[model samples]
Target: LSLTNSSLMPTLNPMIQQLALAIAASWQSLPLKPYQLPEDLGYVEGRLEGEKLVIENRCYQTPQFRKMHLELAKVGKGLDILQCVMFPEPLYGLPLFGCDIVAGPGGVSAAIADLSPTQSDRQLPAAYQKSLAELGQPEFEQQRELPPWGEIFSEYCLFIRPSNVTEEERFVQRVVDFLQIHCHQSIVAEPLSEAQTLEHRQGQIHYCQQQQKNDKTRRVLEKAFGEAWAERYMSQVLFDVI
Candidate 1:
């Protein structure tokens, strides 16, 4: 059931609530495996009691496992607006950290890594070995030639930098805000609430479908950005994916 307040109702900010709910809803629908304790746990004295009763059951414990469990538990409630904004495709297998096609340095590195040998060589620097150790791969040699630390740091900023959000990102945020405020309220009312679980499922499905559509749109925008950047700075750019 959706959370509601009894007191003055706090005059819910529809936009903010929508963003939060959409993110919460999306994470709730993700397919995850059941929690399995590590092998060491199974060997615990209580866990490994003989077929017959042989004292109390013992539970194996690990700080690492507990941390992981906590992380999973917090996914729905702890995710913030920036997390949602940066990577809105969790339910659809598009993790914010790994998906390519965006013009971030990682995407550029992937692109350069996929080019032919000649183009790749020319795009790379002579100190590639040192750079590789620094960057962790020799694959995106071409992306290394770009400005402001090239592909490696660019991708790094996609996660670490605060100003990476573009105008398009803001546009997406506006749309999400609109949906949260008006659409969510309507959906949560009356008959929809009677079948809230089913409605929630349908809503998730619809949102995922929309995300797929937006993915294409975002790709086009990314290409445009990459082209503009390349034209003004470097020529002989190759757009390949590794």
Candidate 2:
């Protein structure tokens, strides 16, 4: 049984009391578990009001506290709050269309993709590529140069319900496998520490924020490629060679 702020005092407490009474009436007829509490009577939360329970803890509305409370409400509605709460820490919310071929000062910025057929398309902005190259290796050349190797990178990322080293390793393996099979590129899987994962999440968030700010560039790209341009781009050589 679940109890919340709304049903705690009046409605649920009474129901629990009546339930105890009804259970006690048929005590002899019921099969009890070995580790079950005694059938005689039980007190809940320092109160013994005829088998009813009450918790004295009160709710507060601080930013974090309120966020958690709303999460509880979402759970009550059968929402997968666990996954949502974990967010980029555990699972990346964005879908991977084909692959990201970052061309900038650095040799290769970052390539993320979904190997699955039904996965949604994802577009990483040219600005994001520039930012990543700048952040990753500031000393690298400023000119935009694609990788010398003629290979594509593909990947299937496995996520943990909660962040962990094991999940990271698994995801890396999937990515390596996809690269090996599709791109014909040899790659190795490496486990990222908690600190590294946090850095990655921060980078992703920063990239997305930058993407949002690049409305003018976005419009230009939209004009160059029609509304469904991303769909066609994924299947063409424009992205791979560019």
Candidate 3:
């Protein structure tokens, strides 16, 4: 019973399913190891605004990454969501890789992907900068604005509301490209000094704190599962501090 296997969810939103599978599959490119999440949090079922709500989470870790988490969520037959975040081990001083898509009856309402820096200066490493520059930007029709708390994202961040099937697939491909680059960089990264590691820890915590400011995400969960469960899921599973 694999919780994150999109193949088990053929009836789910096709774009979200594809993204979930893609995120899960990319873990194969790195040296992955199992990461245990709290028992009940792995797979959750509740009701959101009178519709059945389901959330499935899969998590793993690598030497450089403390957590690589993928979460797929569906509410009734209308809403679908895919969210992934790869948090680096503090010593590795690597950037955080995150992506999310929210789709409903009107199509993809929001899509975003980024490699957010955890350096004290909030800048990606030199290698990452150069490599990202090489990945030519992909154009989409409906660009979405980042929230005020989005300063944690790097310059390479992509936020858009994919207009059609082609844009949706292109968005998927772009996320895969970002994942590849980040994984490659992580595999070859050198560990920072103890002092730098401490700095990175705080940086990561700051990033998580900013992300937790997204009231929309919090409100949805609170309505579905109450404030207590929403807080636990937000801090413990979605954006836990180091």
Candidate 4:
């Protein structure tokens, strides 16, 4: 019957469904609200290895930032994805808020959520640096043997296994840490000076450019939606780099 055997989850759907609710409740205080994605994305139905594959995304904001958004997808087969990534206005020089849930073939589920530093010259607030180091240290140590995930994995990261109660609690607790750090950074953020603004903008553009080229998601999407359409989705909708 159930061939998916693992320590993590029966499937990622239930966990991600609950996680979506928690994320919504947690972001309730921002000045702006979440909105459905614009029609530009060309989202459509498809299949991946006989399972229904579909994607949905939306963005929220406060005029304080360019966007805060989430992407939920049933990657079909043995893979599923729940990913949310936030980018502040380039003026603030704030780190990215990246949260993800991945379900793979084994009983393996990856709960990856963290605040990632930018590849920029802007200095992070000392306290933010301190907390990230402390929180991410343990898992970062274990990650020495992990497959190279290219540019997506940052130096500061937390991997939460959803099967254990303690691990689940730590997952949400770290989420709170991410929110608190992000909130504090947003509050104290000053508009970048003209020089800083330009640098930050370049950093962000380059950031998107890298994902455009090497993201594994692109290959999965191509397998699901076909090359021509997937390529179009990647450029015009997902990353909009080219």
Best by lDDT: 3
| Candidate structures ordered by lDDT, highest first | 3, 4, 2, 1
lDDT of 2 at 57: 20
Q: With candidate 4 superimposed using the best TM-score fit, by how many Å does residue 78's alpha carbon deviate from the native?
A: 4.0
Give the alpha carbon lDDT tens digit for every residue of 16-101 in model 3.
Answer: 77787787778866778879987635778887567776887778888899988888787778888888898999999888999988
The TM-scores of all predictions, comma-separated, are: 0.19, 0.19, 0.93, 0.77
Report the Cα lDDT for residue 216, model 4. Answer: 66
Q: On lDDT, who's better, 1 or 3?
A: 3
Identify the superior model by TM-score, candidate 1 or candidate 3: 3
Whole-model alpha-carbon lDDT for candidate 1? 0.24
Clashing pairs for predicted structure model 4, backbone only: 6-107
Task: Give each model's clash number.
Answer: 3, 0, 0, 1
Instruction: Output the better candidate (1/4) by TM-score.
Output: 4
TM-score of 2: 0.19
Q: Cα miss at 173, model 1 (Å)?
A: 5.1
Q: Per-residue lDDT for 163 in model 1?
A: 28
Residue pairs with backbone overlap in model 2: none
- Judged by whole-model lDDT over C-alpha atoms, candidate 2 comes out at 0.25
- Model 1 Cα lDDT, one tens digit per residue, 67-152: 11111001112111111212111122211111112123221111111110111112312232233234332221123233332232
